[PDB]
Design an enzyme around this catalytic site. Structure first.
Site, mmCIF file in Angstrom:
data_model
loop_
_atom_site.group_PDB
_atom_site.id
_atom_site.type_symbol
_atom_site.label_atom_id
_atom_site.label_comp_id
_atom_site.label_asym_id
_atom_site.label_seq_id
_atom_site.Cartn_x
_atom_site.Cartn_y
_atom_site.Cartn_z
ATOM 1 N N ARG A 180 58.216 50.638 -43.695
ATOM 2 C CA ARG A 180 57.163 51.329 -44.452
ATOM 3 C C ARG A 180 57.727 52.111 -45.654
ATOM 4 N NH1 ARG A 180 57.313 48.093 -42.941
ATOM 5 N NH2 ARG A 180 56.915 47.240 -40.844
ATOM 6 N N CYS A 218 47.360 55.789 -39.611
ATOM 7 C CA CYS A 218 48.243 56.591 -38.770
ATOM 8 C C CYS A 218 48.721 57.842 -39.519
ATOM 9 C CB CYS A 218 49.427 55.751 -38.279
ATOM 10 S SG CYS A 218 49.002 54.478 -37.046
HETATM 11 C C1 LIG Z 1 42.329 52.299 -41.436
HETATM 12 C C2 LIG Z 1 43.774 52.241 -41.945
HETATM 13 C C3 LIG Z 1 44.693 51.407 -41.314
HETATM 14 C C4 LIG Z 1 46.010 51.330 -41.768
HETATM 15 N N1 LIG Z 1 46.903 50.470 -41.115
HETATM 16 C C5 LIG Z 1 48.201 50.334 -41.603
HETATM 17 C C6 LIG Z 1 49.077 49.432 -41.003
HETATM 18 O O1 LIG Z 1 48.744 48.731 -40.042
HETATM 19 N N2 LIG Z 1 50.365 49.338 -41.515
HETATM 20 C C7 LIG Z 1 50.777 50.102 -42.604
HETATM 21 O O2 LIG Z 1 51.918 49.998 -43.031
HETATM 22 N N3 LIG Z 1 49.907 50.999 -43.184
HETATM 23 C C8 LIG Z 1 48.623 51.111 -42.687
HETATM 24 N N4 LIG Z 1 47.762 52.019 -43.299
HETATM 25 C C9 LIG Z 1 48.291 52.889 -44.383
HETATM 26 C C10 LIG Z 1 48.026 52.309 -45.782
HETATM 27 O O3 LIG Z 1 46.967 51.332 -45.740
HETATM 28 C C11 LIG Z 1 49.267 51.649 -46.386
HETATM 29 O O4 LIG Z 1 50.306 52.625 -46.542
HETATM 30 C C12 LIG Z 1 48.956 50.971 -47.726
HETATM 31 O O5 LIG Z 1 50.082 50.192 -48.132
HETATM 32 C C13 LIG Z 1 48.601 51.954 -48.839
HETATM 33 O O6 LIG Z 1 48.143 51.177 -49.946
HETATM 34 P P1 LIG Z 1 47.070 51.797 -50.952
HETATM 35 O O7 LIG Z 1 46.844 50.781 -51.998
HETATM 36 O O8 LIG Z 1 45.913 52.371 -50.233
HETATM 37 O O9 LIG Z 1 47.969 52.968 -51.584
HETATM 38 P P2 LIG Z 1 47.579 54.505 -51.939
HETATM 39 O O10 LIG Z 1 47.253 55.241 -50.707
HETATM 40 O O11 LIG Z 1 46.634 54.503 -53.077
HETATM 41 O O12 LIG Z 1 48.991 54.955 -52.505
HETATM 42 C C14 LIG Z 1 50.112 55.035 -51.617
HETATM 43 C C15 LIG Z 1 51.395 55.130 -52.413
HETATM 44 O O13 LIG Z 1 51.569 53.903 -53.151
HETATM 45 C C16 LIG Z 1 51.680 54.221 -54.561
HETATM 46 N N5 LIG Z 1 51.100 53.095 -55.323
HETATM 47 C C17 LIG Z 1 49.855 52.605 -55.212
HETATM 48 N N6 LIG Z 1 49.720 51.572 -56.047
HETATM 49 C C18 LIG Z 1 50.890 51.385 -56.669
HETATM 50 C C19 LIG Z 1 51.362 50.500 -57.646
HETATM 51 N N7 LIG Z 1 50.607 49.524 -58.167
HETATM 52 N N8 LIG Z 1 52.639 50.623 -58.058
HETATM 53 C C20 LIG Z 1 53.438 51.583 -57.569
HETATM 54 N N9 LIG Z 1 53.036 52.459 -56.652
HETATM 55 C C21 LIG Z 1 51.767 52.366 -56.209
HETATM 56 C C22 LIG Z 1 50.970 55.549 -54.719
HETATM 57 O O14 LIG Z 1 51.430 56.209 -55.898
HETATM 58 C C23 LIG Z 1 51.415 56.263 -53.449
HETATM 59 O O15 LIG Z 1 52.765 56.710 -53.578
HETATM 60 C C24 LIG Z 1 46.430 52.102 -42.858
HETATM 61 C C25 LIG Z 1 45.506 52.939 -43.483
HETATM 62 C C26 LIG Z 1 44.188 53.010 -43.037
HETATM 63 C C27 LIG Z 1 43.191 53.940 -43.742
#
Ligand SMILES: Cc1cc2nc3c(=O)[nH]c(=O)nc-3n(C[C@H](O)[C@H](O)[C@H](O)COP(=O)(O)OP(=O)(O)OC[C@H]3O[C@@H](n4cnc5c(N)ncnc54)[C@H](O)[C@@H]3O)c2cc1C
Ligand SMILES: [Ca+2]
Length: 267
Positions: A151, A198
């Site tokens: 992660r 989480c």
């Molecule tokens: C219901 C639910 C279930 C989930 N299950 C999992 C799971 O099974 N496994 C898991 O690993 N995570 C899980 N997550 C956590 C989350 O979905 C992940 O960490 C996901 O990768 C975050 O992506 P996001 O686009 O929402 O990023 P954001 O929350 O918008 O941003 C997260 C980080 O990524 C950066 N970022 C976003 N876009 C870019 C880009 N284009 N370039 C550079 N940096 C960027 C942001 O600046 C920040 O540092 C879950 C979340 C929820 C709400």
């Protein structure tokens, strides 16, 4: 030179539903991205791993849209594309490699930044190439160059993931769907839905959800923030939670268990 810039509340742009004011820059082109990044910035994906504080953030908050939301499974895939879309599209195309990412509500860029994954697979496994914008220019990397860990990534400083190539393999659609069905089954114990996923990381050889459960902490509530009755590692927003309430609940868990946050806090 004409990208949309507007004042928003980040509570409306995060899956948790908390967060104060920010200046949102919605970028549709490479030239618009070059302009948006001329001052201090953060990148917002689907907001699914963010705990944004009630004061918000002072930097430009960049969202990738336009050309960054278009995709070809067998070519370049924009970083603003939703990972849940790609998971389903891959199945439709008889392309295997994303099944283990079902249930992760990420944009592609966020999934790369946070190497999103499950016991089945992680984002890094599904990458052939990654375009990253940093130091005013676009550069192409292989995933082995991006310092992936559990992660975690180590992108170039200030790096914005803009586009990826996926590593996919032809398989019968029905087989892909069977693999996805197991992922769905494995996720059944998570809240019928609502959170930033989480809350906590797992200690070595331990489980955050199980630990929180055994400690009886499910159902503890600060304002509208509550430890889910369905899963100990989820903090849910019952309506009008403030980030302050969420942080207080986090501290309450940490009084009982040496757990570290999985969420990223802004600012
Ligand atoms: C219901 C639910 C279930 C989930 N299950 C999992 C799971 O099974 N496994 C898991 O690993 N995570 C899980 N997550 C956590 C989350 O979905 C992940 O960490 C996901 O990768 C975050 O992506 P996001 O686009 O929402 O990023 P954001 O929350 O918008 O941003 C997260 C980080 O990524 C950066 N970022 C976003 N876009 C870019 C880009 N284009 N370039 C550079 N940096 C960027 C942001 O600046 C920040 O540092 C879950 C979340 C929820 C709400
Ligand atoms: Ca290169």
């Amino acid at each position: 030179e004409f990208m949309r810039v507007e004042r928003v509340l980040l509570k409306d742009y995060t899956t948790l539903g908390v967060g104060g004011p920010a200046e949102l820059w919605t970028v549709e082109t490479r030239e618009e991205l070059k302009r948006a990044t001329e001052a201090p910035y953060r990148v917002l994906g689907n907001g699914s791993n963010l705990l944004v504080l009630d004061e918000g953030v002072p930097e430009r908050v960049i969202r990738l849209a336009g050309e960054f939301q278009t995709y070809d499974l067998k070519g370049w895939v924009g970083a603003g594309t939703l990972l849940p879309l790609l998971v389903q599209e891959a199945a439709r195309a008889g392309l295997s490699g994303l099944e283990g990412l079902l249930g992760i509500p990420a944009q592609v860029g966020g999934a790369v930044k946070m190497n999103a994954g499950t016991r089945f697979g992680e984002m890094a496994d599904a990458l052939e190439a990654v375009e990253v914008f940093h130091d005013g220019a676009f550069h192409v990397y292989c995933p082995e160059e991006l310092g992936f860990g559990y992660r975690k990534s180590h992108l170039p400083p200030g790096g914005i993931v803009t586009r990826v190539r996926l590593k996919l393999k032809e398989r019968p659609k029905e087989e892909i769907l069977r693999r996805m069905a197991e992922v769905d089954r494995a996720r059944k114990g998570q809240p019928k839905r609502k959170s930033a996923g989480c809350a906590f990381k797992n200690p070595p050889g331990q489980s955050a959800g199980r630990l929180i459960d055994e400690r009886g902490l499910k159902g503890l509530r600060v304002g509208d923030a509550m430890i889910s009755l369905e899963h100990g590692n989820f903090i849910v927003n019952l309506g009008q939670a403030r980030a302050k309430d969420v942080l207080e609940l986090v501290r309450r868990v940490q009084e009982e268990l040496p757990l570290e946050l999985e969420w990223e806090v802004w600012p």
